[PDB]
């Protein structure tokens, strides 16, 4: 119950996945 309870809004935690966003899309 509650699997937000932090409010974090998001964690990748990897710079790989990011790493294709920020190839792929222009995200950033």
């Known amino acids: ?3 937000f309870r932090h409010d974090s809004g998001y964690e990748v935690h990897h710079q790989f996945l990011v ?3 920020e ?4 995200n950033k």
């Open 19 to 21: 790493f294709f966003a």
């Open 1 to 3: 119950d509650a699997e």
């Open 23 to 26: 190839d792929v899309g222009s």
